Design a protein around this ligand. Structure first.
Ligand SMILES: [Mg+2]
Ligand SMILES: [Zn+2]
Length: 2007
RNA sequence: AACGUUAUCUAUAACACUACU
RNA sequence: AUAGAUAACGUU
């Protein structure tokens, strides 16, 4: 803070030019940070601030009476001291990331002060305060000091110092002397990881080819560089500098040529237009016709939607039996002849139950009841069909196939020709997407669908989502609620819901369907039925629709035929076969449909809901690859069309491959085709917003929001943000796993082998200068690598140690996560038995046998075979790099949502570890590189983009102004503007084609050869590794060989056979394709070096052009974002852009990369990078993806955790900028999906609303199948604790006393003991009982001082148990060993004893090979791990969870245990039993205290959230103008544990604080703290009692129970001992947030309303100083409230009040007002009797005081009161004072929006009441123009005349000093935009003058609005009319419109000087006769003045209504 | 499958819908 | 620089 110091340091940086003083200024910056932290800490702690006070001075201070010069005081200077309770404390402020400085300072101070403490007879306590800059976590060594001050609420931001340090580094980064000076140490290397190098590497054939490739000098340089040793040489850069100097000539020559190329460049770049697009489309259609088989028949189409629908019949019934009878009767009465009419009639006769409906119902209920009585399914009781009429009924809605009632030939025809059950090169058949007839048919189909579906439902729209979230959504936005109502009312919603429910029924009944039975499924609709035919898995079904009259059904091209029948027509759909995944997608479809509709329609009146519905119903239900082939390429086509420069034409001609098998696909293809042209047309209609820079931050930025762009998928006008949403969202409509393994595997192999062939036949040369494809310029690459390595190793000097520490190089193999997971891995060897396949090995000889096992099992096998050991991992990595000669790889399909899947490669363990080592080296190198982005954690790339955009905008504006100063001065001529400099902002968004396949691997070798921090032996070993790796062999998967060997017709041009010697071997040698994803960091790094070369080229070219350039290149892996800002005046921008693109391509090709010009594009402003956008400084993301993933897959273990998993996605959507109403929509959809999973919808069987005392499902807790209910900040912050938390806040608000109602949460939670339990309502009582007994433990006490937090306790209560099969588990070697141990006598008890001996292994990774083996063996005991190990189908789990809803699935024994002191139980019975049990329980005030203490008081985050909810106050709303990213601050600043939690647990397992890698004293402190926590929570005692009681109950030691209890104990300990986790969570907020309170305020204000956001401030200080698991019983202070109040008062008095009356006004407001319900006199008393008095010098001086000591302290911070009096005799400011002749002392500014928190008696000055001015909203702005252009309505609030004559005298009591006004200037750049900023206005513009102009203008307007009589306003008749109206308004009930009219007419009379008559106004004597009053008001000629007509007429209507209602 | 994350759960061991319609 | 399981996003 202290921004004055900020521009002081900025000026110092600007004037800085020497590296020898850069060190000094950096030290000064660090000292400034130190003293700023010290000042803030002292202010927080309410103590005096000192700075290095001498120790003798404090000795004298504490003991003045003792003589000096007798005890030798040490020369140490403590930062501060505190003497209380006869104890002295030494305080020092430290700002570091580690505690080394703190611990050494502690030791020194302690040792020095022991003797003084001994002699002075007073103990000395050393307190060291440490604050970590990146995360503001607090560290206090002394516990006694923490006891003295329980609450510490320090919260500050170091971002200013970080920015200044960044500026310093960028200003001096190139300076080598500066780099070596500021180095924190020297370059050192640890012991080499290996003792000997690899001598056989030099004879490797790959290295021979390498050597032959380079010319002789390069070979020599390489071979000496690989032998260079940094340790041996006197300088580590010697070889680097030598190589750089050698290559400097060639590098400079190439740079000079590339720069001088700019003149040759022409102005014709690759901008797209209609000609290119048309030619590309023609080429595309020609190519498609060549490849795909085009059809022109409508009958050849495939079903766009696998469904047919019809309206429901209200005339009929709804019972299931009646529906079945109606369906049978309809099927039995088919009229006409057709192919399958006889079969359908036979089916109708086949299920004819006759009139025996009751007997059939009895049978089905009996069977159902028998089934719903067992955990497992019933065996050995074979079912038998029962003959009811002519139907052999086997189960409810199931019918046996009776051959008697069906003809055999008809049966075979129906099953084969139609049903397809039982059946036995061409091209894919697609419809002509460009044929006019096909498009006409598509248009007709869509119009018919819209016509049928748009009809009203005819039924009430009541449903679960609306009922349970209407209030929340409507409060969020009324428009969204109305749109949802329109969605629900239409026929589209009914159709989609019926389809979903019917498809769910189909899925349910298809499980138990046999091969000779058929099922019937019904939905809510009485006309829609589904028939499910026998199956084997796949689901085969047909849809049947009964309708009164034909051609009235929704036919998405899937209707097989319509036939006449009784009471109308029956429509049969074609037989549909589907997979379970698509089945579940259809089931979940309604959520996707509703979300898509709401997202598309959100805030867009020009769009029509019908078109959005029509498009969404096809997008959501599209489960075919046809729409997949369209959604993906559309993004690139439309973006390139909108882009400034892109090669869209090629893309269309040789990439866009449409696959249109449906008419909807043709429609969407036409939509995309039109969108391309229309996007090219409208690219110039994008307009940027006006940047409101602040000279220290950028606010109100981004891109203007106006709808001019035509919408793509439907007619309408959309905003650019909405345009991007329409472009990008459809990609997320796709479904993953739509590829069939056969074809996708074949295509992946084809692509890989084709790339291999291309690289073998053509690519033979490695180094070239002409930029050959797949070639690298050697010289340039070497020079760039040398420069980048030098810079990186100069940045940090201990790189090798950091690499070893962070990547666990020293620790064991078992301590690395990636080596112990359960991912797939490959094993090679003689594995004949396990795989058994025989035909493959027999026919095909050369089979490199392989198997796919798990990583952890492979590691266990390797450890068992003694191949690997517990030695440091890196040594074993080197040993394996030498030993492992051969590498093998396999591949499979990722199953992504793209048109073509991305192949995924799996390698062996040895390759995994060696690649891990190399890639971690590269990653730790890249972490220092600013350009590298993978180093930045996830979601921080958005922040990087925002920072780059804002800094480049700043550079552009500054450079433009600086260059055009002279021209602007000359202007205030057209030729001068012509010759003035111009700006150009360009954004290149690029990706690289075939990043892994097409790459010169040799270029990485040099990156290792020139590496300094590697010893020559390590270099040799790594190079031998890569030489072996380039000889990798990819193994064809066994399935590919299976389906290739079973063709019987050889392929014409089989590349696989050619590479496999006609399938004679299953291994293919791959050389130049380093596998997909193996070397991300390495590749990325090299690309960053290439971007650095490009940056140098551009800078050199601009120097030749004599201009300014700023280039920012961001490189993730292959996706590159390059931003260029060029200011120059030589030639037009087109030549510059063409040159930039050409040289970008050249540089990208230089380093062996290849820019995908098809997907690479150029934009003026929009910067897309890894799916993150930055329109213009404004971050943006397509949050629709997270919204659509709300109904994704989940664990399906139980309702609560699935609700949690989907709320997770809802939260993630919120974090990306989703509006609150859409967030509620997503949450509601998630709740609906979870409810539908377990049949919990309202009215259904498992609906628990009836069984609980709840008005609606909101009252039921989440764990009891309730619904979420909390404000958005609650869910987004605490993560599902929001339910209980919000319930408790509601309780506090409802039941706390009025006096403490508005106090802090701590005061209320302490006063809770005074509640009357008899008042609580049942619902509340039930919820409190559930919290107290089901969640908490009864043994806890309200007097506890430390307790477990909600994070350390579970929440799930009801969890079904499924008797799942064991699985195969055969390939698992570790499983075989575990089974042998299990069969071994007494092995398990020995393993359990070992685990008890080291219990920390239960919750922490083992650090030893034996420990890892024991943990792996023990992990098999848990059935969950064994079940998860085998492959599973999420759809199968979902279906089984649906099916087992009614079976006893809840084990009530566990739920009973939770309360004091039979088998499985159903959900409904569980609810009944739980209510019966909780009825017997009881509550008391102590129980409520326990609940509140254990739920709220534990976590400081909970306290902060409760406070920010209770004390929130919302200010003036305003539209969201500029977004900005911000990370969430840590809510737990205090840290009680220092070591890592795993280390602390390891130490606590024993009692030895001294463990490996453990600091002794710090470890002892941590162990003491953990022991205190354990003994205070009684957790050890509770565990011991539990295990003892269980042992007594069983009679023998249930050892597994002991293991589980130990696991729970250590888990709770681990979660308590958690330090800061440094989670990276980014939120898009309307403003920048630095502190925690600012972040909370922005979050609260952003998530309340869609249209606008609010400014939120709190009545009291929300934060609380406490630890994670310690109850807090003390509130905070009020110092910050006083600070805010007095800052606001002083600044308001100075800015808006006349100087003469300022002191009197301040005295009065101190006298009687109060701020935030706190008397301002109390605040003045607090500030006066406080040590923070130097911040209020002017305020004190305006009341005298200051005791002559404040001046002394102020002088010490950087002089007599008598001087001050004369100096400030002139200056009348209340916040600004001048202590010296020029020295100025001021008070920090504050936002005026908090001013609403003031109240008191009115302050009447003249005709103005300043109290309303504080209470006002509009007139608090600082801009003169804003004040002068207000409305009379806002000013009207200030009118209090009581006998004034003129306006001027009353207005005299207003500030006459000139204020600031905002003015703007044009930027004159390629993207044209304005710049608005505030500056000091001249004298003639003041608050007085602004008020005068506003009042005169508004009074004239309102006067001419009320000139009723033609004579004039002052005419006697108009005066009489005004007297009449004032009499009327005074007599009748006061109205706000009446008051504003009265004030306006009164001020008009004041302006005309008629007030004396105004105060003489009365009821006219010529007029209580109300009838003639009505006559007169009805006679009033309401004028049509555009501003005033509305209020006048509304006033007239209100008055006439009131007078009518009066009588 | 590698990565970069983010958030959720931590048990000893033959049948759904059947609806405001 | 928790483990296990699951899910989602982005890159390869
Ligand atoms: Mg990209
Ligand atoms: Zn008056």
């Amino acid at each position: 803070m202290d921004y004055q110091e900020y521009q002081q340091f900025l000026a110092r940086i600007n004037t800085a030019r020497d590296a020898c003083v850069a060190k000094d200024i950096d030290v000064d910056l660090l000292m400034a940070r130190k003293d700023y932290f010290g000042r803030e800490l002292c202010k927080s702690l309410n103590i005096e601030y000192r700075n290095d006070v001498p120790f003798i001075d404090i000795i004298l201070d504490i003991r003045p009476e003792v003589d000096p010069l007798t005890i030798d005081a040490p020369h140490i200077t403590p930062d501060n001291y505190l003497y209380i309770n006869n104890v002295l404390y030494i305080i020092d402020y430290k700002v570091s990331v580690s505690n080394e400085s703190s611990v050494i300072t502690y030791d020194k101070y302690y040792e020095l002060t022991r003797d003084i403490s001994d002699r002075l007879s007073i103990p000395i306590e050393i307190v060291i305060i440490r604050i970590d800059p990146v995360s503001r976590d607090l560290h206090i060594n002394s516990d006694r000091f923490k006891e003295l001050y329980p609450t510490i609420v320090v919260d500050i931001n170091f971002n200013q110092f970080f920015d200044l340090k960044q500026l310093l580094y960028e200003k001096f980064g190139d300076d080598e002397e500066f780099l070596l000076k500021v180095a924190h140490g020297d370059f050192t290397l640890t012991a080499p990881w290996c003792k000997t190098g690899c001598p056989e590497f030099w004879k490797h054939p790959i290295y021979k080819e390498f050597k032959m490739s380079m010319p002789v000098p390069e070979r020599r340089l390489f071979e000496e560089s690989v032998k260079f040793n940094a340790y041996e040489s006197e300088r580590w850069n010697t070889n680097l500098v030598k190589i750089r100097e050698y290559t400097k000539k060639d590098y400079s020559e190439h740079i000079s040529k590339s720069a001088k190329n700019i003149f040759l460049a022409s102005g014709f770049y690759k901008q797209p237009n209609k000609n290119e697009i048309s030619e590309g489309w023609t080429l595309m259609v020609e190519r498609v016709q060549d490849q795909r088989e085009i059809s022109k028949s409508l009958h050849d189409q495939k079903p766009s939607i696998h469904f047919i629908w019809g309206a429901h019949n209200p005339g009929n019934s709804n019972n299931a039996t009646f529906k079945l009878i109606l369906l049978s009767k309809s099927l039995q009465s088919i009229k006409g002849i057709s192919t399958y009419t006889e079969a359908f009639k036979s089916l109708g006769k086949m299920m004819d139950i006759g009139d025996k409906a009751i007997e059939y119902e009895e049978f089905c209920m009996s069977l159902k009841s028998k089934a719903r009585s067992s955990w497992k399914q019933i065996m050995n009781k074979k079912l038998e069909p029962k003959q009811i009429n002519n139907a052999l009924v086997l189960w409810e809605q199931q019918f046996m196939i009776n051959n008697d009632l069906i003809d055999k030939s008809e049966k075979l025809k129906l099953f084969k020709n139609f049903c397809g059950i039982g059946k036995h090169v061409s091209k894919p058949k697609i419809l002509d997407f460009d044929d006019a007839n096909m498009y006409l048919a598509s248009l007709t189909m869509m119009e018919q669908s819209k016509k049928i579906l748009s009809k009203s439902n005819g039924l009430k729209p009541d449903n679960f989502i609306l009922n349970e979230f209407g209030s929340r959504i409507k409060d969020a936005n009324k428009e969204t609620y109305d749109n949802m109502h329109k969605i629900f009312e239409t026929g589209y919603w009914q159709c989609i819901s019926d389809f979903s429910t019917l498809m769910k029924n189909i899925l349910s009944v298809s499980q138990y369907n046999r091969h000779n039975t058929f099922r019937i499924a019904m939905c809510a609709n009485n006309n829609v039925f589904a028939i499910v035919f026998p199956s084997a898995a796949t689901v085969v079904y047909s849809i049947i629709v009964l309708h009164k009259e034909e051609e009235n059904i929704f036919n998405p091209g899937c209707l097989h035929g319509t036939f006449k029948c009784m009471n109308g027509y029956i429509s049969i759909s074609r037989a549909i076969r589907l997979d379970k995944e698509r089945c579940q997608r259809i089931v979940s479809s309604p959520g996707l449909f509703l979300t898509t509709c709401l997202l598309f329609k959100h805030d867009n009146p020009t769009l029509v809901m019908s078109d959005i519905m029509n498009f969404s119903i096809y997008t959501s239900l599209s489960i075919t690859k046809s729409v997949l082939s369209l959604t993906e390429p559309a993004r690139y086509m439309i973006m390139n069309s909108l882009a400034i420069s892109s090669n869209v034409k090629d893309y269309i001609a040789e990439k866009f491959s449409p696959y249109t098998k449906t008419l909807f696909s043709v429609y969407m293809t036409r939509l995309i085709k039109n969108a391309c042209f229309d996007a090219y047309d409208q690219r110039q209609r994008v307009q940027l917003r006006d940047i409101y820079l602040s000279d220290y931050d950028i606010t109100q930025k981004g891109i203007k929001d106006n709808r001019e762009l035509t919408s793509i998928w439907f007619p309408g006008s959309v905003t650019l943000k909405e345009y991007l949403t329409q472009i990008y969202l459809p990609f997320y409509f796709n479904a993953k796993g739509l590829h069939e393994k056969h074809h996708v595997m074949v295509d992946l192999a084809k692509t890989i082998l084709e790339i291999e062939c291309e690289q073998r036949e053509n690519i033979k040369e490695i180094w070239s200068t002409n930029c050959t494809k797949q070639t690298v310029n050697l010289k340039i690459l070497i020079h760039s690598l040398c420069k980048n390595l030098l810079a990186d190793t100069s940045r940090h000097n201990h790189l090798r140690n950091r690499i070893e520490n962070r990547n666990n190089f020293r620790r064991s193999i078992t301590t690395i996560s990636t080596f112990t997971s359960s991912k797939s891995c490959l094993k090679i060897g003689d594995f004949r038995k396990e795989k058994e396949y025989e035909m493959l090995r027999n026919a095909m000889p050369n089979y490199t046998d392989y198997i796919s096992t798990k990583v952890f099992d492979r590691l266990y096998e390797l450890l068992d075979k003694k191949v690997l050991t517990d030695k440091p991992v890196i040594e074993q990595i080197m040993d394996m790099m030498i030993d492992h000669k051969k590498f093998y790889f396999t591949f499979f399909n990722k199953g992504q949502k793209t048109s073509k899947d991305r192949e995924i490669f799996v390698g062996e363990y040895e390759a995994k570890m060696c690649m891990y080592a190399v890639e971690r080296i590269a990653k730790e190198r890249c972490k220092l590189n600013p350009d590298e982005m993978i180093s930045e954690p996830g979601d921080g790339k958005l922040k990087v983009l925002e920072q780059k955009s804002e800094q480049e905008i700043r550079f552009l504006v500054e450079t433009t102004r600086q260059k055009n100063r002279e021209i602007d001065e000359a202007i205030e001529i057209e030729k001068l503007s012509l010759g003035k400099a111009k700006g150009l902002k360009m954004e290149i968004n690029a990706d690289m084609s075939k990043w892994s396949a097409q790459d010169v691997f040799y270029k990485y070798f040099w990156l290792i050869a020139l590496d300094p921090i590697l010893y020559p032996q390590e270099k040799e070993r790594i190079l031998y590794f890569m030489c072996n790796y380039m000889d990798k062999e990819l193994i064809l998967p066994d399935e590919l060989l299976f389906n290739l060997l079973d063709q019987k017709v050889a392929y014409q041009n089989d590349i696989i056979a050619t590479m496999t010697n006609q399938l004679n071997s299953n291994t293919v040698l791959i050389k130049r394709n380093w596998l997909q994803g193996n070397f991300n960091y390495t590749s990325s790094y090299v690309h960053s070096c290439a971007m650095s070369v490009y940056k140098e080229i551009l800078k050199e070219a601009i120097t030749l052009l004599d201009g300014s350039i700023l280039v920012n290149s961001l490189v993730h892996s292959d996706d590159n974002q390059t931003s260029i800002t060029i200011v120059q005046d030589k030639m037009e921008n087109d030549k510059i852009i063409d040159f930039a693109m050409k040289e970008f391509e050249r540089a990208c090709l230089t380093f062996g990369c290849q820019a995908n010009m098809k997907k690479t594009y150029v934009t003026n402003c929009i910067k897309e990078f890894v799916s993150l956008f930055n329109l213009y400084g404004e971050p943006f993301s397509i949050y629709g993806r997270f919204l659509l993933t709300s109904v994704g897959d989940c664990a399906y273990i139980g309702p609560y955790e699935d609700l949690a998993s989907r709320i997770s996605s809802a939260q993630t959507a919120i974090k990306h900028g989703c509006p609150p109403s859409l967030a509620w929509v997503s949450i509601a959809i998630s709740h609906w999906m979870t409810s539908l999973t377990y049949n919990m919808l309202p009215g259904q069987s498992n609906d628990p609303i009836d069984y609980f005392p709840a008005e609606n499902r909101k009252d039921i807790p989440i764990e009891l199948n309730g619904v979420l209910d909390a404000p958005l900040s609650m869910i987004s912050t605490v993560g599902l604790e929001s339910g209980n938390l919000y319930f408790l806040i509601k309780l506090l608000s409802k039941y706390t006393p009025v006096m403490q109602k508005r106090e802090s949460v701590v005061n209320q939670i302490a006063e809770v003991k005074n509640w009357k339990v008899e008042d609580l309502t049942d619902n509340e009582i039930f919820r409190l009982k559930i919290l107290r007994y089901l969640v908490l433990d009864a043994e806890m006490d309200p007097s506890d001082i430390m307790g477990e937090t909600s994070d350390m306790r579970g929440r799930s209560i009801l969890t079904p148990r499924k008797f799942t099969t064991a699985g195969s588990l055969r390939k698992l070697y570790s499983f075989s060993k575990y089974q042998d141990r299990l069969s071994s006598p007494g092995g398990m008890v020995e393993l359990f004893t070992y685990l008890l001996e080291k219990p920390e292994l239960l919750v922490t990774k083992g650090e030893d090979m034996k420990d890892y083996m024991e943990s792996v063996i023990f992990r098999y005991n848990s059935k969950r791990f064994k079940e998860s190990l085998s492959i599973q189908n999420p759809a199968q789990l979902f279906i089984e969870q649906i099916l087992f809803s009614h079976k006893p699935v809840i084990d009530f024994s566990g739920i009973r245990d939770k309360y004091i002191n039979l088998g499985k139980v159903t959900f409904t019975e569980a609810y009944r039993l739980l209510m019966r049990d909780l009825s017997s329980l009881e509550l008391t005030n102590d129980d409520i205290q326990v609940i509140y203490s254990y739920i709220i008081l534990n976590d400081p985050m909970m306290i902060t959230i409760a406070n920010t909810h209770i004390l929130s106050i919302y200010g003036s709303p305003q539209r969201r103008m500029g977004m900005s990213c911000s990370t969430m601050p840590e809510f737990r600043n205090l840290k009680l544990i220092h070591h890592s939690p795993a280390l602390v647990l390891r130490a606590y397992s024993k009692n030895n604080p001294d463990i490996q890698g453990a600091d002794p004293t710090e470890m002892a402190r941590d162990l003491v703290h953990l022991k205190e926590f354990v003994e205070n929570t009684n957790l050890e005692e509770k565990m011991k009692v539990r295990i003892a009681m269980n042992e007594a109950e069983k009679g023998q030691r249930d050892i597994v129970f002991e293991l589980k209890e130990m696991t729970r104990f250590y888990q709770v300990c681990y979660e308590y001992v958690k330090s800061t986790e440094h989670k990276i969570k980014v939120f898009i907020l309307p403003a920048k947030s630095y502190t925690t309170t600012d972040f909370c305020s922005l979050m609260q204000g952003n998530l309340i309303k869609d249209k606008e956001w609010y400014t939120v401030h709190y009545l009291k200080q929300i934060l609380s100083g406490g630890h994670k698991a310690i109850m807090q019983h003390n509130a905070t202070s009020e110092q910050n409230i006083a600070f805010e109040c007095f800052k606001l008062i002083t600044h308001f008095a100075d800015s808006f009040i006349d100087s003469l009356s300022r002191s009197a006004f301040l005295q009065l407001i101190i006298d009687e007002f109060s701020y935030k319900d706190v008397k301002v006199s109390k605040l003045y008393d607090i500030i006066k009797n406080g040590y923070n008095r130097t911040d209020f010098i002017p305020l004190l001086f305006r009341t005298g005081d200051l005791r002559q000591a404040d001046l002394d302290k102020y002088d010490a911070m950087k002089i007599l009161i008598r001087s001050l009096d004369y100096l400030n005799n002139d200056i009348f400011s209340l916040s600004r004072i001048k202590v010296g002749l020029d020295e100025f002392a001021t008070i920090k500014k504050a936002h005026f929006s908090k001013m609403v928190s003031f109240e008191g008696p009115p302050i009447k000055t003249g005709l103005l009441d300043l109290t309303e001015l504080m209470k006002s909203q509009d007139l608090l702005n600082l801009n003169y123009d804003n004040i002068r252009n207000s409305n009379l309505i806002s000013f009207s609030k200030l009118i209090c005349c009581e006998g004034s004559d003129n306006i001027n005298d009353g207005l005299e009591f207003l500030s006459d000093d000139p204020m600031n006004f905002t003015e703007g200037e044009a930027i004159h750049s390629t993207p044209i935009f304005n710049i608005y900023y505030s500056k000091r206005g001249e004298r003639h513009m003041t608050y007085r003058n602004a008020i005068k102009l506003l009042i005169e203008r508004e009074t004239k307007i309102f006067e001419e609005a009320f000139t009723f009589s033609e004579n004039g306003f002052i005419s006697p008749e108009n005066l009489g009319c005004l007297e009449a109206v004032v009499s009327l308004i005074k007599l009748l009930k006061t109205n706000e419109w009446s008051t504003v009219i009265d004030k306006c007419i009164h001020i008009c009379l004041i302006k005309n000087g008629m007030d004396h008559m105004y105060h003489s106004f009365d009821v006219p004597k010529c007029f209580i006769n109300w009838v003639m009053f009505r006559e007169f008001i009805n006679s009033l000629p309401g004028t049509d003045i555009p501003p005033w007509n509305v209020m006048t007429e509304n006033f007239k209507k209100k008055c006439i209504a009131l007078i009518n209602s009066k009588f």
